[PDB]
Ligand binder design. Structure first.
Ligand SMILES: *C/C=C(C)/C=C/C=C(C)/C=C/C1=C(C)CCCC1(C)C
Length: 137
């Protein structure tokens, strides 16, 4: 698996519907969808250790994890969570998340490297799945 790379988004499906579940009001959802157009993911993978940097025009966040060990990050709408990533197959991993404080929809995400050289990210909140497709820069 070579997840490593500089990935740029080419398609984003159901993102607004995802943010709706997460309680984001309509004007901010529209502004967020527009911001997801200028949006890049940088991945460094060594074995089952990952470094992931997610960037938009004005904001950037870094994620560090090892497959199989709990780490802390944030949900899509920004609330801290405990996360755990496992492989589903050679080139797909799934992350389950647990809210640190409080309650909300069940969130998770997946990353997959296709045989065509695309990266596919899915983000889920309850029954809503957002799919985003990236290609290498
Ligand atoms: C493994 C890749 C992951 C976990 C990517 C997560 C991506 C996000 C949490 C993206 C969030 C965004 C917003 C909350 C609004 C602005 C646009 C995005 C897509 C960068």
């Amino acid at each position: 698996p070579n997840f490593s790379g500089n990935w740029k988004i080419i398609r984003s499906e159901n993102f607004e519907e995802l943010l709706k579940v997460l309680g984001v009001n309509v004007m901010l959802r529209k502004i967020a969808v527009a911001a997801a157009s200028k949006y890049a993911v940088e991945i460094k993978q060594e074995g089952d250790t990952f470094y992931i940097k997610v960037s938009t025009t004005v904001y950037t966040t870094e994620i560090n994890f090892k497959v199989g060990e709990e780490f802390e990050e944030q949900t899509v709408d920004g609330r801290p969570c405990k996360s755990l990533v496992k492989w589903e197959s050679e080139n797909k991993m799934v992350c389950e998340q647990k809210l640190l404080k409080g309650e909300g929809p069940k969130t998770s995400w997946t990353k997959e490297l296709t045989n065509d050289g695309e990266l596919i990210l899915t983000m889920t909140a309850d029954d809503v799945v957002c799919t985003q497709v990236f290609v290498r820069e």
